[PDB]
Amino acid sequence: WLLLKLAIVFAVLIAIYGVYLDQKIRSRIDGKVWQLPAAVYGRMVNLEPDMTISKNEMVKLLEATQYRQVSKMTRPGEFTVQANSIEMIRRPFDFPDSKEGQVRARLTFDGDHLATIVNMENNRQFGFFRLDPRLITMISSPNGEQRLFVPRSGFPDLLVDTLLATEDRHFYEHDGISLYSIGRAVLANLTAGRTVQGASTLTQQLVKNLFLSSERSYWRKANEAYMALIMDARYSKDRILELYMNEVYLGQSGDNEIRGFPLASLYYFGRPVEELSLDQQALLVGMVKGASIYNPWRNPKLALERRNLVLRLLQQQQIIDQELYDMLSARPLGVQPRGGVISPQPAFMQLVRQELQAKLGDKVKDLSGVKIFTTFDSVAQDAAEKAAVEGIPALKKQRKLSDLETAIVVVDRFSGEVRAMVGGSEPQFAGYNRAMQARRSIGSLAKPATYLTALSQPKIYRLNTWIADAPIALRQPNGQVWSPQNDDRRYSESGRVMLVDALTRSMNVPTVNLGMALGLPAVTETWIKLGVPKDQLHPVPAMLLGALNLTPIEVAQAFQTIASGGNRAPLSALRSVIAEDGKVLYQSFPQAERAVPAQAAYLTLWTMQQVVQRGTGRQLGAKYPNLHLAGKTGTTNNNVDTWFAGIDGSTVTITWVGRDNNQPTKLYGASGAMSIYQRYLANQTPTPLNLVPPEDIADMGVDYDGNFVCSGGMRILPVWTSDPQSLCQQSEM
């Protein structure tokens, strides 16, 4: 003719263009679809019968782990409260130790301990019950696209319907050949074009997002149609919407694109997609059309009407009715955290990233769908953050200041595992992390090292050992004379104090005489074993009183070493690093090292309970007498810094209060740091400190003179002896 000969030649190369398209769609799908960023999780708590935890403590623990209080549990991630129990649906979690599904459980309490954890489905007791970890954040992926991969089955059939009720019928590929005829006929041609009117199948919307550019292609829709004919031909409808539901752009976080319903549900609502309500699903689905302008942060009015349109669109099709309509529209969209949620826990994340580098180097950022399990505690953090946010403006007002900063570090007493980190007064927005970057003179926090060095010598130094408290003059290597004074510029009437009272009252003059008698090399060695940085130790008499500049985290290591009964446990934020296939890339293990004798650490801890009960920290002791806290105070010269090292039955807490410019704070007696700690304790349930005396510890009596007696005596002090017959040697006088 011949429009066929050449018109047939058109058919040939467009079908081979189609086999250039199929051969390239496979390359994407058959393997790496996206670079899935790392998942960062908090601690995984194991509930156990007889555990020292109360009903009120557990509610706060559950709430802190994304659990919602209800009256009728219908969903996973919910809990009810009774007079003596908690009923919960422990959500399914891919636990490293063993994968688990939903568990309907009852936690029966008998104050202040958990008695039983019973499965409500079989009436059987659990030897131990696992709590799922809370997702802290995602480590930013380079191409700026954030996703949390959830398989097809993770998506509830309802959200699947809510989606189809807005964008499909799903009998597709060919993709609505008749839609193109109406879609282009409605507008009555004429160039365009407005409205088209959303002439796109789910398989057309997928190919667009996954494979094609933003716009300028009227050629694209037809090129996308060509791809939406290949995809639904070789991939089942189940895979189409598995890929689709993880790709869809749903929001923004500065320079990071929030995409896919799984990460979106947590981002806007704080729940994994499986736990979403219908009003929540409808909004999320409705956002798809335009994710940026349907922002419940920026313009709720618009989003509050869209969600409501999806509510009204769903009732039009089969599923719902106005009995559940009128109320669903009334329910406010959010359920909105109200925070920008740009960078969660920045201070604690610096430690995580630093530790990730030290343990795996570079060849870890190469991998996809990585799972990072941290030591992070949600309860301890919230309490520390609150103490900072509330305590700082309170102190600024009382003392009257224009600026004031803080730093809190909470570590496991025994394991060294970091539970909480506060880098400033505004922890929600941080760039300077004072917990790891603020190097400061520790002041009187340097005192226990000297007493721990002395008490490590049980045949020479004991708690009843008399120390001179009289004027000092120390000739130094310039000729200048060092004359240290006690905070009050006074000396003891008798010219002497006992070791026990010298540390209880943080006495300067008796600490120098003790330190100088032991010698600086000896005290310098204790500091090394406690775990402080080697390059910060300058062995001059001044260091016995605080001429030692450390960060709160470095201080936390030193006090952990002593709080654990003499075992130095290197501080850490990493519990494990797991690949998507389940390969254990990194696994932490106990590496605690015996630093100082058990008995020497016990006598220091016992004396530290005395500072809190009757000495420098007595104001705290009187507020919480039943906790028997072991602590130590710090106030540097010219009120530059206030410090507090507090030990409960479970944690070591280092609180620092000072100004970024190193200026006076008008606060003394560790008043700043001690009242921030006071709030931290008031904001949660601290563990009472019950000291287990190690072997060779004997409570001995002394007379007013400080000499051991057989029976009686006016004062009882613990002593490191296998044979308390030091009494006889003393009594024989």
Ligand X SMILES: *C(=O)[C@@H](NC(=O)/C(=N\OC(C)(C)C(=O)O)c1csc(N)n1)[C@H](C)NS(=O)(=O)O
Ligand Y SMILES: C=C(C/C=C(/C)CCC=C(C)C)CCC(C)(C)/C=C/CC/C(C)=C\CO[C@H](COP(=O)(O)O[C@H]1O[C@H](C(N)=O)[C@@](C)(O)[C@H](OC(N)=O)[C@H]1O[C@@H]1O[C@H](CO[C@@H]2O[C@H](CO)[C@@H](O)[C@H](O)[C@H]2O)[C@@H](O[C@@H]2O[C@H](C)[C@@H](O[C@@H]3O[C@H](C(=O)NC4=C(O)C=CC4=O)[C@H](O)[C@H](O)[C@H]3O)[C@H](O)[C@H]2NC(C)=O)[C@H](O)[C@H]1NC(C)=O)C(=O)O
Chain residues binding its own copies by CB under 8 A are 3-4, 7-8, 10-11, 14-15
Q: What is the CA radius of gyration of the chain?
A: 33
Inter-CA distances, 324 with 279, 287, 311, 562, 654, Å: 10, 21, 10, 61, 52
Q: Is 635 in the site for ligand X (CB under 6 A)?
A: yes
Least separation in angstroms between CB 9 and its own copies: 9
Separation between Cα atoms, residue 497 and residue 461, nearest integer Å: 13
Q: Do 498 and 463 touch, CB atoms closer than 8 A?
A: yes
Separation between Cα atoms, residue 264 and residue 258, nearest integer Å: 7
Task: Indicate which of ligand X, its own copies, ligand Y, none lies near residue 200 (CB less than 5 to 8 Å, by partner kind).
Answer: ligand Y
Q: Do 550 and 439 touch, CB atoms closer than 8 A?
A: yes
> What 3-state class would DSSP assign to 243?
helix
| CA-closest candidate to residue 286, choices 108, 464, 387, 162 | 162
> What is the 3-class SS of 563-575, one letter each residue?
HCCCEECCCECEE
> What 3-state class would DSSP assign to 614?
coil
Q: Is 249 in the site for ligand Y (CB under 6 A)?
A: yes
Angle 223-228-230 from CA coordinates, rounded to 5°: 100
Binding residue count for ligand Y, defined by CB under 6 A = 18
Interface with ligand Y (CB under 6 A), residue from 52, 209, 485, 638: 209
Pick the closer one to its own copies by CB: 19 or 309: 19
- Residue with nearest beta carbon to ligand Y: 290
Least separation in angstroms between CB 441 and ligand X: 4
Q: Is 196 in the site for ligand Y (CB under 6 A)?
A: yes
The window from 248-256, 474-482, 597-605, 650-658 that contacts ligand Y (CB under 6 A) reads: 248-256
Least separation in angstroms between CB 4 and its own copies: 6
Task: Indicate which of ligand Y, its own copies, ligand X, none lies near residue 291 (CB less than 5 to 8 Å, by partner kind).
Answer: ligand Y
Q: Is 487 in the site for ligand X (CB under 6 A)?
A: yes
> What 3-state class would DSSP assign to 206?
helix
63, 167, 257, 525: which is the annotated catalytic residue? 167
Q: Is 204 in the site for ligand X (CB under 6 A)?
A: no
The window from 70-78, 287-295, 321-329, 718-726 that contacts ligand Y (CB under 6 A) reads: 287-295
Q: Do 689 and 609 touch, CB atoms closer than 8 A?
A: yes
To the query of whether residue 98 is one of the catalytic residues in this protein, the response is no
Pick the closer one to its own copies by CB: 9 or 528: 9
To the query of whether residue 588 is one of the catalytic residues in this protein, the response is no
Interface with ligand X (CB under 6 A), residue from 346, 424, 634, 646: 634
Task: Indicate which of ligand X, ligand Y, its own copies, none lies near residue 249 (CB less than 5 to 8 Å, by partner kind).
Answer: ligand Y
Task: Indicate which of ligand X, its own copies, ligand Y, none lies near residue 3 (CB less than 5 to 8 Å, by partner kind).
Answer: its own copies
Amino acid, single-letter form, for residue 672 = G
Q: Do 120 and 12 touch, CB atoms closer than 8 A?
A: no
Q: Is 168 in the site for ligand X (CB under 6 A)?
A: no
Say how far residue 8 (Cα) sits from the centre of its chain: 65
Task: Indicate which of ligand X, its own copies, ligand Y, none lies near residue 671 (CB less than 5 to 8 Å, by partner kind).
Answer: none
Task: Mark residues 220-239: x for contact with ligand Y by CB under 6 A, - for none.
Answer: -x------------------
Task: Indicate which of its own copies, ligand X, ligand Y, none lies near residue 637 (CB less than 5 to 8 Å, by partner kind).
Answer: ligand X
Pick the closer one to ligand Y by CB: 192 or 682: 192
Interface with ligand X (CB under 6 A), residue from 146, 200, 425, 633: 633
437-476: contacts with ligand Y (CB under 6 A) = none
481 Rama class: left (phi>0) / alpha (psi -120 to 50) / beta: beta
Least separation in angstroms between CB 146 and ligand Y: 12
Token couple for 485: 């004074």
The window from 67-75, 295-303, 439-447, 707-715 that contacts ligand X (CB under 6 A) reads: 439-447
Interface with ligand X (CB under 6 A), residue from 637, 663, 722, 725: 637
Separation between Cα atoms, residue 524 and residue 386, nearest integer Å: 37
Separation between Cα atoms, residue 223 and residue 14, nearest integer Å: 11
Q: Which H or E run contains 172?
A: none
Interface with ligand Y (CB under 6 A), residue from 13, 16, 293, 728: 293
Least separation in angstroms between CB 30 and ligand Y: 23
The window from 82-90, 263-271, 628-636, 658-666 that contacts ligand X (CB under 6 A) reads: 628-636
Q: Do 560 and 413 touch, CB atoms closer than 8 A?
A: yes
85, 200, 441, 444: which is the annotated catalytic residue? 444
Least separation in angstroms between CB 1 and its own copies: 9
Task: Indicate which of ligand Y, its own copies, ligand X, none lies near residue 636 (CB less than 5 to 8 Å, by partner kind).
Answer: ligand X
529-548: contacts with ligand X (CB under 6 A) = 545-546
Token couple for 533: 């940085």
Token couple for 444: 């009187």
Pick the closer one to ligand Y by CB: 203 or 345: 203
Separation between Cα atoms, residue 146 and residue 616, nearest integer Å: 51
The window from 180-188, 490-498, 631-639, 708-716 that contacts ligand X (CB under 6 A) reads: 631-639
Pick the closer one to its own copies by CB: 199 or 372: 199
Separation between Cα atoms, residue 529 and residue 540, nearest integer Å: 19
Pick the closer one to ligand Y by CB: 116 or 252: 252
Pick the closer one to ligand X by CB: 332 or 471: 471
Alpha helices in 438-563 (DSSP H): 447-455, 499-504, 508-518, 520-530, 552-563
- What DSSP string runs through 249-295? EEEEETTEEEESHHHHHHHHTSS-GGG--HHHHHHHHHHTT-SSSS-
Separation between Cα atoms, residue 323 and residue 116, nearest integer Å: 41
- Residue with nearest beta carbon to ligand X: 444
Pick the closer one to ligand X by CB: 269 or 643: 643
Phi then psi for residue 304, to 5 deg, are -70, -20
Least separation in angstroms between CB 219 and its own copies: 14
Residues in the chain: 733
Separation between Cα atoms, residue 72 and residue 22, nearest integer Å: 50
Burial of 51 (0-12, 13-18, 19+ CB in 10 A): middle
**Cβ contacts of residue 193 below 8 Å, gap of 6+?**
187
Separation between Cα atoms, residue 223 and residue 217, nearest integer Å: 9
| CA-closest candidate to residue 731, choices 710, 705, 703 | 710
Q: Is 444 in the site for ligand X (CB under 6 A)?
A: yes
Task: Indicate which of ligand X, its own copies, ligand Y, none lies near residue 192 (CB less than 5 to 8 Å, by partner kind).
Answer: none
Which chain residues interact with ligand Y by CB under 6 A?
Answer: 167, 196, 198-200, 205, 208-209, 221, 248-249, 252, 288-293
Give contact residues for ligand X (rule: CB under 6 A). Answer: 441, 443-444, 487, 506, 508, 545-546, 616, 633-637, 669-670
Supply the residues annotated as catalytic.
167, 444
